[PDB]
Design an enzyme around this catalytic site. Structure first.
Site, PDB file in Angstrom:
ATOM      1  N   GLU A 179       0.835  -1.194   0.000  1.00  0.00           N
ATOM      2  CA  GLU A 179       0.000   0.000   0.000  1.00  0.00           C
ATOM      3  C   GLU A 179       0.867   1.240   0.000  1.00  0.00           C
ATOM      4  OE1 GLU A 179      -2.993  -0.231  -0.836  1.00  0.00           O
ATOM      5  OE2 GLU A 179      -3.153  -2.397  -0.428  1.00  0.00           O
ATOM      6  N   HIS A 182       1.766   2.126  -3.512  1.00  0.00           N
ATOM      7  CA  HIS A 182       0.744   3.024  -4.096  1.00  0.00           C
ATOM      8  C   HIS A 182       0.856   4.452  -3.588  1.00  0.00           C
ATOM      9  CE1 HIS A 182      -1.535  -0.061  -6.129  1.00  0.00           C
ATOM     10  NE2 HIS A 182      -1.935  -0.623  -5.001  1.00  0.00           N
ATOM     11  N   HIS A 236       3.613   6.207  -5.430  1.00  0.00           N
ATOM     12  CA  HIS A 236       3.151   6.497  -6.804  1.00  0.00           C
ATOM     13  C   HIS A 236       2.330   7.821  -6.802  1.00  0.00           C
ATOM     14  CE1 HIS A 236       2.363   5.640 -10.892  1.00  0.00           C
ATOM     15  NE2 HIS A 236       1.401   4.749 -10.772  1.00  0.00           N
TER      16      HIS A 236
HETATM   17 ZN   LIG Z   1      -2.580  -2.701  -4.882  1.00  0.00          ZN
END
Ligand SMILES: [Zn+2]
Ligand SMILES: [Mg+2]
Length: 662
Positions: free
Chosen positions: A455, A458, A461
């Site tokens: 997580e 992410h 990102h």
């Molecule tokens: Zn994911």
């Protein structure tokens, strides 16, 4: 007035959660929709000649109130819902769907967009122009008036059904939490897990009892340790019966409507529609890849099953798998899950693992802000800085399970980065770790450690986004690419110098012995047959639901036949999600896209090799990966970005090696 009506004045545009109450949502949604509709009407009826700025950029600027209320509202509906929020969600979701369609099916607006030339546009602007045309066409802008009317109705019904699925699943999951009256029945469970179950029972209104809530996937963690076989069966039956019967006719209706929708838009199946905006080039490419992986995965699961039967000395039921796998791990590697847990405390994992790796790799730093207000009292807010000391964004962590929080784990953005708006990223991670009683440490399984790194991948990102236009911000990439930056960030959970940094006893601070940590690492190659098969079975199940020729009559019959036809109906290895609790595909956006994980994992495993080729955990390498891939969001073609980064198109051998599939 209403806290959604103006931009947040807080650091990074953190929403003013202390001022936001449930009564603010409906009026803000109503104002937001009306103001965006007015904006779109002004663009569509602009008497000035169409330009990128007065049409596409103008659409990007629109909907400021609606974006603000949606960011908070959808964050709450997933993470900390209540009956009032659920009622609002039922009312508003259909209106939002009709709103989106009022814009995408505005004929003069689409005509304006089509009149814009790419001449004099920079690279991201030209890419956005194409993206806008594609978004409109995929929403039905080229359909005739009758078909548009049918599409609007299909979309609204789909949005209402997916909402009902989500609400059904939460109520049934919460109600299916397993209540244990006698602590003796928890024999085998770590002391810390017994206290958490007592704490859960207390929190859910049953003091003196013990409650074991269900996690999202089929496999429940406690089965690895619980010696009471009847309790293992009871937990497994509670798991596999989620959404039965209330989600069965519902998902049949969803899959049926998706097929009708896809045909209306000119595609033979929902999967063909989905794949048309994925990095995967064709439906055949997806099925060909899954067809290659499935036979060796199944043969590994059969060998593993034979090993577990020999360990047990008898035939197994599904609720025995984890339990005997743990026995084999202890015998083979001297790794006892109860003895590993004390080395993985949440605060240490977070600071000395997740944050530490990001600091070593990217140079970024973190300051906890217990004075800033998150959306729930257990949310930790962190300010994130670049190596040079400049401000980067905000990261919010929400680690604990609770009845108001949906299953699984996910990342979402409260504020999207764009240079258009001059906004900085505000990102969120939600996990479902069992909350200990007051004072007690939060000891994690390695699966939970991995999820935290996933997580956080992410989050990075999102945090690293440097795009011009919000349409391309952060994680706005195809679903079969989005799981690359998350899965690649998991590499740092097992990178030995990082793992050695955070794998330290919660009481003494003593590192795990080097030779035991070696074995904890080795032991994660174990059980790849089960892991891969349950994943592939769920993938093929999703695929079958979204490629059927004739609509299914019975959800449970369809599932059975789907798995049997695909050669993955293994009694001991159920799919990672069964149809009636497959939230990924019925309520989150992974329909005909659950294959996204393994498709992205190709890139992840090939990227791990890139790190090894380039000297490993070095700032230079983090800068490269940030600059070439993570900072681009959707603003460049993702496979082009990958190729510029990697030096070539991806190879599948590294994934095959990792999962034992060679
Ligand atoms: Zn994911
Ligand atoms: Mg050794």
């Amino acid at each position: 007035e209403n806290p959604f009506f103006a931009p947040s004045a807080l650091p990074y545009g953190l929403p003013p959660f202390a001022e936001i109450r449930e009564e603010h949502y409906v009026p803000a949604f109503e104002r937001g929709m009306a103001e965006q509709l007015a904006e779109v009407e002004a663009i569509a009826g602009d008497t000035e000649a169409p330009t990128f700025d007065n049409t596409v950029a103008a659409l990007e600027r629109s909907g400021q109130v609606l974006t603000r209320v949606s960011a908070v509202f959808f964050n709450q509906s997933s993470s900390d819902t209540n009956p009032t929020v659920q009622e609002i969600q039922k009312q508003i979701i259909p209106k939002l769907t009709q709103h989106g369609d009022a814009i995408h099916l505005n004929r003069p607006l689409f005509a304006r967009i089509k009149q814009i030339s790419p001449d004099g546009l920079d690279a991201e602007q030209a890419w956005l122009l194409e993206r806008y045309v594609t978004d409109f066409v995929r929403a039905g802008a080229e359909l005739g008036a009758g078909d548009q009317e049918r599409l609007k109705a299909l979309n609204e019904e789909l949005s209402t059904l997916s909402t009902r699925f989500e609400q059904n699943l939460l109520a049934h999951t919460n109600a299916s939490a397993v209540i244990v009256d006698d602590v003796a029945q928890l024999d085998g469970l770590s002391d810390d897990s017994v206290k958490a179950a007592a704490e859960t029972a207390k929190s859910r209104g049953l003091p003196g009892k013990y409650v074991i809530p269900l996690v999202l996937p089929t496999g429940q963690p406690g089965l690895a340790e619980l010696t009471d076989r009847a309790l293992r069966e009871r937990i497994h039956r509670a798991s596999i019966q989620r959404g039965v019967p209330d989600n069965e006719e519902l998902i049949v209706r969803i899959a049926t409507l998706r097929a009708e929708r896809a045909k209306l838009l000119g595609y033979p199946t929902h999967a063909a529609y989905v794949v048309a905006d994925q990095t995967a080039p064709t439906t055949e490419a997806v099925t060909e890849m899954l067809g290659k992986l499935t036979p060796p995965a199944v043969a590994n699961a059969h060998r593993e099953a034979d090993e577990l039967r020999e360990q047990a000395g008898h035939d197994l039921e599904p609720w025995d798998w984890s339990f005997y796998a743990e026995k084999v791990l202890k015998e083979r590697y001297a790794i006892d899950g109860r003895q590993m847990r004390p080395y993985f405390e949440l605060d240490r994992v977070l600071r000395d693992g997740v944050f530490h790796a990001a600091t070593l790799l990217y140079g970024i730093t973190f300051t906890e802000r217990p004075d800033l207000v998150g959306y729930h009292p257990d949310v930790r807010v962190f300010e994130v800085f670049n190596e040079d000391g400049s401000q980067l964004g905000l990261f919010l962590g929400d680690y604990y399970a609770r009845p108001s929080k949906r299953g699984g784990a996910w990342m979402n953005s409260l504020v999207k980065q764009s240079t258009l708006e001059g906004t900085r990223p505000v990102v969120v991670n939600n996990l479902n770790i069992a909350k200990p009683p007051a004072g007690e440490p939060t000891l994690m399984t390695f699966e939970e450690v991995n999820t935290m790194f996933h997580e956080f991948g992410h989050a990075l990102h999102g945090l690293f986004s440097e795009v011009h236009y919000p349409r391309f911000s952060g994680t706005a990439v195809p679903r079969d690419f989005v799981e690359y930056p998350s899965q690649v960030n998991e590499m740092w959970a097992v990178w030995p110098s990082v793992l050695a940094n955070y794998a330290r006893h919660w009481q003494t601070g003593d590192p795990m012995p080097k030779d035991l940590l070696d074995r904890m690492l080795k032991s994660q190659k174990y059980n790849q047959g089960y892991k891969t098969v349950e994943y592939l079975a769920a993938t093929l199940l999703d695929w079958s639901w979204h490629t059927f020729q004739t609509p299914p009559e019975n959800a449970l019959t369809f599932e059975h036949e789907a798995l049997t036809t695909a050669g993955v109906d293994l009694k001991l290895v159920p799919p990672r999600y069964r149809s009636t609790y497959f939230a990924h595909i019925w309520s989150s956006g992974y329909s005909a896209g659950y294959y996204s994980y393994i498709w992205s994992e190709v890139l992840d495993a090939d990227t791990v090799d890139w790190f090894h080729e380039n000297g490993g955990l070095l700032r230079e390498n983090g800068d490269t990966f940030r600059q070439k891939l993570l900072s681009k969001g959707g603003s460049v073609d993702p496979m082009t970005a990958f190729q510029s980064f990697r030096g070539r198109t991806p190879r599948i051998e590294p994934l095959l090696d990792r999962r034992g599939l060679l």
